[PDB]
Design a protein around this motif. Structure first.
Motif, mmCIF file in Angstrom:
data_model
loop_
_atom_site.group_PDB
_atom_site.id
_atom_site.type_symbol
_atom_site.label_atom_id
_atom_site.label_comp_id
_atom_site.label_asym_id
_atom_site.label_seq_id
_atom_site.Cartn_x
_atom_site.Cartn_y
_atom_site.Cartn_z
ATOM 1 N N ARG A 1 1.194 -1.653 0.422
ATOM 2 C CA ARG A 1 0.272 -0.049 -0.412
ATOM 3 C C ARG A 1 1.381 0.835 -0.006
ATOM 4 O O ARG A 1 0.142 2.568 -0.155
ATOM 5 N N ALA A 2 1.736 1.469 -0.074
ATOM 6 C CA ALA A 2 2.912 1.869 -0.105
ATOM 7 C C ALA A 2 2.796 2.977 1.139
ATOM 8 O O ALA A 2 2.592 4.014 1.274
ATOM 9 N N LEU A 3 2.515 2.508 2.420
ATOM 10 C CA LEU A 3 2.387 3.301 3.933
ATOM 11 C C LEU A 3 3.266 2.929 4.323
ATOM 12 O O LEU A 3 4.252 1.749 4.162
ATOM 13 N N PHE B 1 3.789 7.510 -2.770
ATOM 14 C CA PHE B 1 2.975 8.169 -4.044
ATOM 15 C C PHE B 1 3.373 6.840 -4.697
ATOM 16 O O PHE B 1 4.875 5.936 -5.367
ATOM 17 N N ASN B 2 2.251 6.129 -5.441
ATOM 18 C CA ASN B 2 2.545 4.197 -6.173
ATOM 19 C C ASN B 2 2.201 4.621 -7.484
ATOM 20 O O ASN B 2 1.082 4.707 -8.063
ATOM 21 N N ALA C 1 0.700 2.276 -9.699
ATOM 22 C CA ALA C 1 -0.747 1.869 -9.367
ATOM 23 C C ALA C 1 -1.656 2.950 -10.831
ATOM 24 O O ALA C 1 -1.769 3.709 -10.821
ATOM 25 N N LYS C 2 -2.885 1.805 -10.706
ATOM 26 C CA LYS C 2 -4.047 2.056 -12.164
ATOM 27 C C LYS C 2 -4.978 2.215 -11.460
ATOM 28 O O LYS C 2 -5.281 1.858 -10.471
ATOM 29 N N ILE D 1 -15.710 -0.358 -11.266
ATOM 30 C CA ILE D 1 -15.566 -0.336 -10.099
ATOM 31 C C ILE D 1 -17.419 -0.496 -10.206
ATOM 32 O O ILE D 1 -17.549 -0.922 -8.718
ATOM 33 N N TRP D 2 -18.229 -0.101 -10.916
ATOM 34 C CA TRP D 2 -19.513 -0.408 -10.627
ATOM 35 C C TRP D 2 -19.897 -1.381 -11.234
ATOM 36 O O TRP D 2 -21.065 -1.966 -11.097
ATOM 37 N N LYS E 1 -23.356 0.181 -2.683
ATOM 38 C CA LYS E 1 -22.544 0.075 -3.671
ATOM 39 C C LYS E 1 -24.146 1.152 -4.017
ATOM 40 O O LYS E 1 -23.850 1.930 -4.927
ATOM 41 N N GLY F 1 -23.225 5.326 -3.136
ATOM 42 C CA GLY F 1 -22.311 5.248 -3.912
ATOM 43 C C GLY F 1 -22.758 6.013 -5.563
ATOM 44 O O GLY F 1 -22.374 6.830 -6.075
ATOM 45 N N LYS F 2 -22.897 5.056 -5.912
ATOM 46 C CA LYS F 2 -23.907 5.329 -7.319
ATOM 47 C C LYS F 2 -24.952 5.819 -7.759
ATOM 48 O O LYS F 2 -24.081 6.774 -8.969
ATOM 49 N N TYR G 1 -22.450 9.644 -7.874
ATOM 50 C CA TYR G 1 -21.848 9.543 -8.524
ATOM 51 C C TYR G 1 -22.477 10.051 -9.879
ATOM 52 O O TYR G 1 -21.811 10.927 -10.852
ATOM 53 N N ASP G 2 -24.162 8.916 -10.193
ATOM 54 C CA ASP G 2 -25.219 9.031 -10.899
ATOM 55 C C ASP G 2 -25.443 10.708 -11.083
ATOM 56 O O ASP G 2 -25.926 11.564 -12.262
ATOM 57 N N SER H 1 -17.457 8.411 -4.066
ATOM 58 C CA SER H 1 -17.447 7.788 -3.787
ATOM 59 C C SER H 1 -17.642 6.063 -4.993
ATOM 60 O O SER H 1 -17.667 5.244 -4.427
ATOM 61 N N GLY H 2 -16.810 6.499 -6.187
ATOM 62 C CA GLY H 2 -16.029 5.137 -6.577
ATOM 63 C C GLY H 2 -14.738 5.124 -5.194
ATOM 64 O O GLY H 2 -14.966 3.524 -5.729
ATOM 65 N N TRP I 1 -15.646 2.970 -2.535
ATOM 66 C CA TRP I 1 -16.778 1.628 -2.974
ATOM 67 C C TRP I 1 -15.814 0.824 -3.263
ATOM 68 O O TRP I 1 -15.654 -0.399 -2.702
ATOM 69 N N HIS J 1 -12.922 0.738 -2.550
ATOM 70 C CA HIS J 1 -12.428 -0.113 -1.064
ATOM 71 C C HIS J 1 -12.556 -1.208 -0.238
ATOM 72 O O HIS J 1 -12.369 -1.759 0.740
ATOM 73 N N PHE K 1 -6.356 6.854 -6.183
ATOM 74 C CA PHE K 1 -5.562 5.748 -5.931
ATOM 75 C C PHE K 1 -4.566 5.352 -6.410
ATOM 76 O O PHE K 1 -4.282 4.496 -7.063
ATOM 77 N N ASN K 2 -3.264 6.243 -6.457
ATOM 78 C CA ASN K 2 -1.849 5.751 -6.011
ATOM 79 C C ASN K 2 -1.829 6.150 -4.703
ATOM 80 O O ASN K 2 -0.804 6.109 -4.448
ATOM 81 N N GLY L 1 -1.961 4.510 0.092
ATOM 82 C CA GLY L 1 -2.655 3.636 0.509
ATOM 83 C C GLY L 1 -3.821 4.406 1.677
ATOM 84 O O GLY L 1 -3.966 4.270 2.146
ATOM 85 N N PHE L 2 -4.323 5.653 1.853
ATOM 86 C CA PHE L 2 -5.149 6.619 2.301
ATOM 87 C C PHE L 2 -5.820 6.090 2.420
ATOM 88 O O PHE L 2 -6.740 5.101 1.294
ATOM 89 N N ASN L 3 -6.741 5.614 3.104
ATOM 90 C CA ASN L 3 -8.624 5.135 3.528
ATOM 91 C C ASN L 3 -9.243 5.854 2.900
ATOM 92 O O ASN L 3 -9.100 6.827 3.480
#
Lengths: 447, 447
Positions: free
Chosen positions: A87-89, A433-434, A437-438, A445-446, B28, B31-32, B35-36, B65-66, B69, B71, B395-396, B398-400
């Motif tokens: 998790r790069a933590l 910073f990872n 990661a993608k 996601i959905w 889910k 969050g959707k 998002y929507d 939202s994404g 969810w 995570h 997404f890059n 490790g923070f929750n």
């Protein structure tokens, strides 16, 4: 109070410069002085608090001191403590500051030791507010702990105690500190969660015990009796009831009698004990932590010498009998069940009566029944095939050794687990910073 | 309030029967729907709260939202969730009950969504008390979330909102619930930890940023500007200062100007901005979440069109300049340092001024410098080589993912980490008897 807080912050800043090894030297000596003086502390606690058993308090000091030290001696609580590259933590342990700890009358020696060891393990200081009826022995514990800290060159005033614990002084102490520990009655815990500071408390105990069908009733009786009679039953995890199957009820009772229990089934005599343990729906303070014979004499019922616990046949589960409430004395209530699901329902009703969120005990070889009880019962700890008083830690189970057993949201506590060093430190995170990661797309996601 | 609490408990007992899969379907969809409906929610939030940027709030609803969810979609939060045979432990996840959540004006849409997803994930119900200046858009978020819950057959009233949030009603709401979440000012957080219930809150932010010597100052400038200007700087983790090395100071400033910063060195011109951002030692509420040009016009200073942030040369570290406090607007304070140790001391003094316990940023290629700053700074999150607004999840890193960033004991919070589903569930333990375990002797313990 303002002087104690400032003296504690001055000590905490000096203690924050300590390494992991220097902190560990202090924490070990704190528990070892309680172990080495177990006989003196126990004699003083029994005389001052006027409750408990000398021999059990000696074993309490020997057990709690060694079990807590053996558990935290290798735990990393200073600086960078953990790497997590997936998790790069990077995790960093930091003290919380000054701890305000209110200690109970039932554990006046081990609780100041336990909270001080956990606080100093994380480079925190602590101010101890003892129970009024146990302030002398709790101060003597703090005195001997500070004497060992002085010989090791520790910064002065890392452990302090309020000699004049006024109700407003305790309120000011909990509001001025950085984190609060409340081990005692529900009134002391509610005040801790009303101080505007992060707090850790306990809930009322009422350990329900289910004896499953086919289990070794002799071993179950020995474990339940050992837990119920320990320190005259003032431990908050002590066994309170015997939920036994109706088809083997006489067999289970015979195993209790075989191991030193006195069983009472008559409607009267049982009422003679009930009217002595509870007066107006509340526990009689004159039998709290008293022996079997003292309760027997007050109840006017002849109980044979050598009896370890008294087992009373209950009228019904829940509010159908006041005996189903918490009893801080070597007395158990006995109830019958038909199905194991009904046994859980019986334990559920007694928790709604009192003690929800604390500890339960079960004696079973059916893992499906054990997992079902732990899934639905409002408890923080399910103790399996051992005395329920081991919920605070033993060398034979996985519970973290402690004297402060948090009871979760049911008992209006922040945590539903045993209080350790970990709840007295802030764990920070370094987030790298990872770049590899993608970012997932909308479908990832959905979808 | 009593009616809301009871309706929440009735729904919580119905939701408690849900399996892991049935709960995940509800989480889910919560969050959707954000998002929507991101474009509509963002437009309403800007108009009602009169702060922030439309396009940034659209990206906020899409990301939060994404990421939340993604995570928690596979996290086990119902029943038996973890096996640990080495300690003879079985972990059981149980709901805490009714959650009382107070949501802020800065994140009026994602915060009700974040808290509701984390609460329902653990079979809890939630009552939302919105900020008065954002009650309409927060209620619309709850409305559309409840509309999606109704179509899935969810129990009624698992999410409720107080339309008339009286001060006494908010006090009773926190005292009556089983656990409290307070995302907002320190006054709301202090009331949460004064309710007699376990509470989760936040602290004031003041993200100090250290630019280390030799780093890509262009990339550092781009990341800091991105975080400072996001939503006009109302995110509690937004960059607040630029602690740059004195030997490369003009180089770092030129990198900020190259990427859209307007740098002010003239003391008289800096004072025109300082007297506009702060009036009587406190931040001017009229410029909170306002654009660069609105701040420029009020300050009477011409700022070129297209400017993204304003950088002001500070008078000194700590209380030597009010610009070192939290600034909820796209304005940065610039400070010089000689050694990296001094750079940490400067950030330290700013955290003692305001914001201790929250987030810090650092842009460095020296891992020793990164680990040293994280070891000593009173922070819960050190964000490395990325915009500081990623402290709430990315997404890059490790923070929750979250909208409620706890600040530990410094900020008078229970946790020094991001708020997740896990802080709203009770984790109980089934402790089996390890008969094969060995009891350490006196030599093994104290040797």
């Amino acid at each position: 109070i303002k002087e104690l807080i400032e003296k504690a912050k001055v000590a905490q800043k000096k203690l924050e410069a300590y390494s992991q090894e220097q902190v560990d030297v202090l924490v070990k000596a704190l528990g070892k002085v309680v172990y080495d003086n177990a006989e003196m502390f126990a004699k003083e606690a029994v005389e001052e608090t006027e409750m408990g058993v000398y021999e059990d308090k000696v074993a309490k000091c020997h057990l709690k001191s060694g079990a807590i030290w053996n558990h935290i001696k290798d735990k990393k609580t200073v600086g960078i403590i953990k790497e997590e590259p997936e998790r790069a933590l990077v995790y960093v342990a930091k003290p919380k500051g000054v701890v305000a700890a209110t200690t109970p009358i039932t554990n006046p020696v081990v609780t100041p030791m336990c909270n001080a060891m956990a606080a100093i393990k994380g480079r925190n200081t602590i101010i101890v507010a003892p129970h009024p009826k146990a302030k002398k022995v709790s101060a003597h514990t703090v005195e001997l702990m500070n004497a060992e800290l002085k010989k090791l060159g520790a910064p002065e005033n890392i452990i302090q105690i309020v000699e004049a614990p006024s109700r407003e002084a305790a309120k000011e102490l909990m509001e001025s500190a950085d984190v609060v520990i409340a081990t005692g009655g529900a009134g002391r815990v509610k005040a801790a969660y009303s101080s505007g500071r992060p707090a850790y408390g306990v809930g009322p105990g009422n350990s329900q015990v289910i004896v499953d069908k086919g289990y070794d009733y002799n071993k179950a009786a020995q474990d339940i009796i050992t837990g119920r009679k320990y320190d005259n039953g003032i431990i908050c995890s002590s066994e309170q009831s015997v939920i036994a199957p109706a088809e083997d009820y006489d067999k289970v009772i015979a195993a209790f009698v075989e191991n030193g229990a006195f069983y009472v089934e008559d409607e009267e005599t049982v009422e003679k004990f009930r009217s002595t343990l509870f007066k107006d729906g509340k526990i009689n303070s004159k039998i709290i932590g008293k022996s079997v014979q003292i309760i027997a004499d007050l109840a006017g019922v002849k109980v044979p010498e050598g009896t370890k616990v008294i087992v009373l046949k209950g009228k019904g589960a829940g509010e159908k009998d006041v005996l189903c409430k918490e009893k801080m004395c070597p007395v158990l209530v006995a109830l019958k069940y038909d199905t194991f699901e009904e046994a859980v329902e019986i334990a559920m009703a007694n928790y709604m009566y009192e003690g929800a969120g604390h500890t339960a005990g079960i004696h079973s070889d059916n893992d499906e029944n054990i997992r079902y009880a732990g899934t639905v019962l409002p408890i923080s700890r399910l103790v399996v095939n051992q005395p329920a008083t081991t919920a605070g830690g033993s060398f034979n189970n996985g519970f973290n050794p402690t004297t402060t057993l948090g009871c979760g949201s049911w008992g209006r506590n922040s945590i539903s687990e045993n209080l350790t060093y970990e709840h007295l430190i802030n764990v920070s995170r370094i987030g790298y910073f990872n770049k590899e990661a993608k970012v997932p797309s909308y479908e990832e996601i959905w979808g």
